[PDB]
Curated annotation (Swiss-Prot), chain A:
Changing residue 24 to L: Increases slightly the interaction with RBD domain of SARS-CoV-2 spike protein. This is Angiotensin-converting enzyme 2. It is found in: Cell membrane; Cytoplasm; Cell projection, Cilium; Apical cell membrane. The chain holds residues 19 to 615 of 805 of the full protein. Its cofactor is Zn(2+); chloride. It comes from Homo sapiens (Human). The gene is ACE2. Changing residue 7 to V: Increases slightly the interaction with RBD domain of SARS-CoV-2 spike protein.
Curated annotation (Swiss-Prot), chain B:
Changing residue 16 to F: Decreased HLA binding to NF9 epitope. Increased binding affinity to human ACE2. This is Spike protein S1. The gene is S. The chain holds residues 438 to 534 of 1273 of the full protein. Residues 11-19 are annotated as: Immunodominant HLA epitope recognized by the CD8+. It comes from Severe acute respiratory syndrome coronavirus 2 (2019-nCoV). Attaches the virion to the cell membrane by interacting with host receptor, initiating the infection. The major receptor is host ACE2. When S2/S2' has been cleaved, binding to the receptor triggers direct fusion at the cell membrane. When S2/S2' has not been cleaved, binding to the receptor results in internalization of the virus by endocytosis using host TFRC and GRM2 and leading to fusion of the virion membrane with the host endosomal membrane. Alternatively, may use NRP1/NRP2 and integrin as entry receptors.
Amino acid sequence: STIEEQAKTFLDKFNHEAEDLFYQSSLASWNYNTNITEENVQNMNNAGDKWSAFLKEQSTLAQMYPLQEIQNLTVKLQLQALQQNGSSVLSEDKSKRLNTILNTMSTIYSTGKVCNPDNPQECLLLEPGLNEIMANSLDYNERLWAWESWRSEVGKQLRPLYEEYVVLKNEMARANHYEDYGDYWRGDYEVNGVDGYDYSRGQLIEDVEHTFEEIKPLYEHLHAYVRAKLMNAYPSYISPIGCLPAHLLGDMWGRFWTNLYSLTVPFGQKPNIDVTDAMVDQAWDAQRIFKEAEKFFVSVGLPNMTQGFWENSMLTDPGNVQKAVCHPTAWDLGKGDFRILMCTKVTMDDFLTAHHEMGHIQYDMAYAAQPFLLRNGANEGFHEAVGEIMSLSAATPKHLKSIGLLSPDFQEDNETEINFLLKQALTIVGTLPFTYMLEKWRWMVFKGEIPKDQWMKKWWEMKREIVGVVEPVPHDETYCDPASLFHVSNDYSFIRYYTRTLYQFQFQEALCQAAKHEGPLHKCDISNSTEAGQKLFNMLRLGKSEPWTLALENVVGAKNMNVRPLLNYFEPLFTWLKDQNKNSFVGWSTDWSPYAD
Amino acid sequence: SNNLDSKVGGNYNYRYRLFRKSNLKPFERDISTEIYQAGSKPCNGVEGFNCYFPLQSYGFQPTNGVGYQPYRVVVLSFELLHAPATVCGPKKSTNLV
């Protein structure tokens, strides 16, 4: 009758056809990851190209339905995914040149290596060599050579490639009604046509800026603590009031202080929570580690797994002849067929990783009944944020004592809680301003506020102001540090880590109140609380059919990122970092550098 | 019938109607291939803008789930009319004393 029948009919046609075609690429990817062969990789790319071509052919009808006078949110969100042309707005030469840049940038980043100045015959590759130098090795000279040489050999070569990547991407985004490709990433959270829950694209810029200043009281105290500990190991280079060198952060990109735990132990005499020895004595294996993990998911009140879920999953590497990808990955093959790939071992690192990947399945299985275009997460934050809250609760010793891995006689005191709690802040608090740093710099580059010659000049300036970090050697205009990151060279968004980080504690606070936990969140344990998993599933089942702000309003009590549950998690840590910083300066001083004289 | 009727790539011999200009009646059947019209323009026998071919094939693959797998369904309707009974159940018996 009306025009409304066209969209409701066209989407059902696409939701019928795009369903099976997309799964052919997913199961083709499953076959490749389970058996890396020249035969499976061809079907993987052919299946993706087949489905990818179907998406563009279908856009001819998606664009003939104006969404101007339409109020149906279901019709708008689904057609908007197909109405966007993306890379199809430019000519084949510009689109192909873009992929040639990304393919070349990924190769230069992947094949990077550094030989020692005294051993020209021993070059260490990006993985596993140089990552071990920044993570495990404590030698000042080795950490410096791996950092500065990486910037000159890999950073400089990616600078001219990153220039073409920005200008080509900006033309694509601007053609799709955006300000720049920086705003394109911000469009993941956009909401239009809903009263009281709308969300502008550029609103993410004020949100990260607002939450950043609220993180600073917790970050400035941790920055002085790690600086004081690293100063004792490197007193001839680190001042007690200056900045932290960039090559002593724990990685080749300066993102996590997790590798600095050995140098920043609160109490090296007291024990930690670890059930590695407890599991092997009980004769646990990859299946039992997965099975008892399911009891936690059922104990909270979430749906259990299907018989085909465990039967078709991967638990180890089936030989070198059919070597599989041992990386943890939660797979949605479709038609209710969900699986996980993991080479699980008997250790606590795999105990929590299993809950992490299983949490990803709970996300996808919840909204699996939605339409195909709406069978996806509302945003990248919700996808990965829900994964960590289930593993962090399992890491709580209260759950281990109930399961029986951690013995009941294991004492718990404020001293041991700081050993675990401070270890997380090095990962969370030591990374939150760093993600805000990179995306703020990149967002200014896509918009064009920083000239292409002033990339290294402003990058060093932002490092001293935001994070309080300085390079080990001065870099001229020819260097490009953030281009040497994996997420940057491969056209990936890094803002999701900031959003996922704060959303993680937000959802945790909502469930801890549901499970009735008193005190800080670090001792929270939602295990054996049927109301906890029940309230979560009400949010997981929404998918992307409603605004993400609506999901946060009725669950965590907010419509955007917030730092309140972060300080609640690290509440006693703020008292510990304060006590440790009594003999040092809180914050940082931009006038100090390791090469100063 | 997932172990019986499913096929690699979907059993295209089993199909069903997705759209119809009107609702069916009890025990009604219709196998027409008329294009479902929504707008005022004629479809000209082809689907597209405000036009859609109503029938579509099933995705009965061996990897389907409990909700998507094929189920051999049979409906047994009983009729009690003025005409005499033509079908009944079996009656019990025993030995002969």
